[PDB]
Design a protein around this ligand. Structure first.
Ligand code: SAM
Ligand code: DNC
Ligand code: K
Ligand code: MG
Length: 214
């Protein structure tokens, strides 16, 4: 047998142009639109993600929740040389697929995949992964981790003035306690981007929360 994630990877390996990141993204989106839905950020919201990367030019980017590597590829393809994306994924099998997806897309030099929980890995980023501070963080893992991982990042001293937090799904499935914290707090400048749930007409949005310092 096989899983949906293997089926998404199979489709890419069989239909996308090796080494072409845009091709990989289109192959994934077309499969998911036409065959089976999957929780990739997708093309519509992906464009908003692209604009934030192009606007902030992060050199150290952290991703929470990699899944099949769609957003990893989507973001890594826009990064300058020497820039690095660190992506954390709790599921080893998804991490295996993400790694292959990133290899096939031609952006493996930009990506550092870590297998483990965000809450476990975040306190190790300075000692084990040579991070000083993060330039940007994409939050797209289980929504109940959004707030406590944000607080962890802050407490571990990983945020600096101008650090960009970008969170998917803040409307659907939703991340209300995260939104309340960053929107109510004097330590964050927030912007909401309304859009649509990936592959659907259900309304969703992302939240951009710029850390203003402690
Ligand atoms: C929505 S998918 C990520 C999709 C990816 N960002 C994209 O757009 O292509 C959610 C992922 O986060 C992972 N996840 C959930 N909780 C996590 C945690 N605490 N630490 C790391 N990964 C987690 C899940 O296993 C799943 O692969
Ligand atoms: O259920 N969904 O439609 C989604 C969508 C998403 O974009 C998700 O990131 C998600 N999740 O991580 O739980 C779930
Ligand atoms: K605020
Ligand atoms: Mg999502």
């Amino acid at each position: 047998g096989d899983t949906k994630e293997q089926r998404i990877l199979n489709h890419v390996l069989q239909h996308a142009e090796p080494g072409n990141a845009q091709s990989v993204l289109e192959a994934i989106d077309t499969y998911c639109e036409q065959k089976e839905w999957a929780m990739n950020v997708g093309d519509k919201k992906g464009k908003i993600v692209d604009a934030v990367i192009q606007e902030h030019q992060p050199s150290v980017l952290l991703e929470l929740g990699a899944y099949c590597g769609y957003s990893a590829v989507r973001m890594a393809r826009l990064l300058s040389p020497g820039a690095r994306l660190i992506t954390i994924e709790i599921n080893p099998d998804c991490a295996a697929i993400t790694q292959r997806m990133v290899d096939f897309a031609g952006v493996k030099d930009k990506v550092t995949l870590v297998v483990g929980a965000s809450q476990d890995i975040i306190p190790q980023l300075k000692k084990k992964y040579d991070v000083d501070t993060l330039d940007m963080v994409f939050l797209d893992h289980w929504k109940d981790r959004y707030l406590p991982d944000t607080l962890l990042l802050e407490e571990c001293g990983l945020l600096r003035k101008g650090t960009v937090l970008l969170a998917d799904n803040v409307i659907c499935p939703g991340a209300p306690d995260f939104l309340a914290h960053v929107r109510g707090s004097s330590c964050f400048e927030c912007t909401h981007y309304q859009s649509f749930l990936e592959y659907r007409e259900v309304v969703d949005g992302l939240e951009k929360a710029i850390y203003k310092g402690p």
